[PDB]
Amino acid sequence: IAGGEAITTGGSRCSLGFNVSVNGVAHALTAGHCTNISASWSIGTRTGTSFPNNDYGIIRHSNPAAADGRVYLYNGSYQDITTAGNAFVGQAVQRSGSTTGLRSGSVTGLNATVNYGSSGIVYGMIQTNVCAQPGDSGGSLFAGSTALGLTSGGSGNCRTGGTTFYQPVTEALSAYGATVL
Amino acid sequence: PAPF
């Protein structure tokens, strides 16, 4: 299973962010508002969660062979991931997620504060003009082979377009001492 | 905005 593919728990669905390593042990990063739901996922057991404030969580794979260090492009191909980086305003990016597949756009702001009402407030989010829909959360924000973020939320949809916010992946990697595969 |  690669970045952007579906991960579920009971009736809930999110998308996988990035497969990572923690001291050689395979894990998967996804959104914290997703891992807050349950400790038991289709791919394994949750070992960390942070939402709101942040929006990241990590799951240890039950099957280490499934930790595919790529992003699925929803066209039968995959993008290889080799590093993690920080986004910059004006950067051309792509997002992969299980509801809408692959979409592209550009970064329009950094360190945005996002109020999700009853769900709380998240800080320091990457802002983009890429569309997303429910189910896309936790999925991959990347530029070529560089991992940049995890889908958190936004407004609109993929027919009318909208604004989306992402948790910077470097903060999630350092929280857990993880490195992207 | 809302969580996806």
A36, A42, A43, A47: CA torsion to nearest 10: 20
- Chain B residues 1-4 within an 8 A CB cutoff of chain A: 1-4
Q: Scanning every residue of chain A, which has its alpha carbon at the shortest distance from the alpha carbon of B4?
A: A134
- Mode of pairing for the β-strands spanning A92-97 and A101-115: antiparallel
Question: Do residue A160 and residue A80 come from a single domain?
Answer: yes
- Mode of pairing for the β-strands spanning A83-84 and A146-157: parallel
Q: Are A169 and A147 in contact (CB under 8 A)?
A: yes
Determination method here? X-ray
Q: Which residue has the tokens 């800080």?
A: A123
- Mode of pairing for the β-strands spanning A56-61 and A25-30: antiparallel
Burial class of A174 by CB neighbour count within 10 A (0 to 12, 13 to 18, 19+): exposed
Question: Do residue A4 and residue A28 come from a single domain?
Answer: yes
Q: How far apart are CA A108 and CA A105, in angstroms?
A: 9
Q: Provide the resolution (angstroms).
A: 1.8
Q: Which residue has the tokens 């989306």?
A: A164
Q: Indicate if A33 belongs to the active site.
A: yes
- Identify the three-state secondary structure at position A33: helix
Tally of domains within chain A: 2
Q: How far apart are CA A120 and CA A66, in angstroms?
A: 33
Asked if A155 lies within 8 A of B4 by C-beta distance, the reply is no
Asked if B4 lies within 8 A of A153 by C-beta distance, the reply is yes
Residue A145: count of CB within 10 angstroms of its CB:
15
Q: How far apart are CA A148 and CA A143, in angstroms?
A: 7
CA distances from A73 to A95, A96, A98, A165, A171 (A): 9, 7, 10, 20, 24
Of A115, A117, A134, the CB nearest to B4: A134
Q: Indicate if A12 belongs to the active site.
A: no
Q: Which residue has the tokens 């992402």?
A: A166
Question: Do residue A83 and residue A163 come from a single domain?
Answer: yes
Which residues of chain B have a CB within 8 Å of the CB of A115? 1
Domain extent at residue A159: 69-168
Read off the amino acid at residue A83.
T
Of A33, A136, A155, the CB nearest to B1: A155
